[PDB]
Design an enzyme around this catalytic site. Structure first.
Site, PDB file in Angstrom:
ATOM      1  N   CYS A   1      67.893  62.421  32.560  1.00  0.00           N
ATOM      2  CA  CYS A   1      68.960  63.374  32.946  1.00  0.00           C
ATOM      3  C   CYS A   1      68.355  64.435  33.860  1.00  0.00           C
ATOM      4  O   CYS A   1      67.907  65.477  33.395  1.00  0.00           O
ATOM      5  CB  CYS A   1      69.540  64.037  31.695  1.00  0.00           C
ATOM      6  N   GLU A  99      72.381  59.619  37.760  1.00  0.00           N
ATOM      7  CA  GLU A  99      71.229  58.746  37.568  1.00  0.00           C
ATOM      8  C   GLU A  99      71.108  57.926  38.856  1.00  0.00           C
ATOM      9  O   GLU A  99      72.111  57.490  39.413  1.00  0.00           O
ATOM     10  CB  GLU A  99      71.432  57.793  36.385  1.00  0.00           C
TER      11      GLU A  99
END
Length: 213
Positions: A1, A99
């Protein structure tokens, strides 16, 4: 993250965590570590609050800039999270996160950024070293609790953030809940079946640790 998005009105985050119990800088679609993202917590005198804390924890004795907190290290009560699991529990609201999907091997590979989200604002579990009277520096920054075991939602080399249901989220920020209870909650994160995602076509960055030129 390595990147998140906070685009909803701040009052919407509070409404989800603390329904019926009210408490400006514009929405941020691209938020990286080293900034002051909105966070919700009860770190000072058990009072519920909505404030901006520094994302990125730098231990006093190292040159590490930890942005994610490995779920298992927290479970095994390891360094350095064992020092915050009791009194540094916070929540980081987010509409979604990013991502990057490696499109090839070799050095500096072309990566395709993806945006992941749910049907409503997410409540990411987090750990912060900030406390009342402390400066808002890296020495008091926070990390998002991640579930490394399952990798990213799209990128298997990333770490998906542990999102909690509002009920469990409240228990997490409640200074009264023991560390033992906190550890259990941590593994009750929302399943992937609750998120959808798409490739972002605009410029957001070349990699998780690469801000857009």
């Amino acid at each position: 993250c390595g990147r998140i998005a906070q685009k909803s009105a701040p009052e919407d985050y509070v409404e989800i965590l603390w329904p019926n119990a009210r408490l400006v800088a514009g929405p941020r679609y691209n938020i990286p570590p080293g900034t002051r993202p909105l966070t919700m917590h009860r770190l000072v005198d058990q009072a519920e609050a909505l404030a901006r804390l520094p994302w990125g924890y730098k231990p006093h004795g190292s040159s590490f800039f930890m942005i994610n907190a490995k779920l298992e290290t927290i479970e095994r009560h390891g360094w350095p999270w064992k020092l915050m699991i009791g009194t540094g529990r916070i929540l980081v609201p987010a509409d979604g996160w990013y991502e990057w999907k490696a499109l090839d091997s070799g050095p500096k590979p072309a990566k395709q950024p993806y945006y992941i989200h749910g049907d409503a604002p997410l409540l990411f579990a987090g750990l912060s070293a900030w406390r009342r009277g402390a400066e808002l520096d890296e020495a008091h920054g926070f990390a998002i609790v991640t579930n490394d075991a399952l990798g990213g939602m799209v990128d298997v080399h990333d770490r998906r953030p542990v999102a909690l249901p509002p009920e469990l989220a409240r228990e997490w920020v409640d200074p009264a809940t023991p560390v033992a209870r906190a550890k259990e909650i941590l593994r009750a994160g929302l399943p992937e079946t609750a998120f959808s995602w798409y490739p972002v076509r605009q410029e957001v960055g070349s990699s998780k640790y690469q801000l857009p030129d």
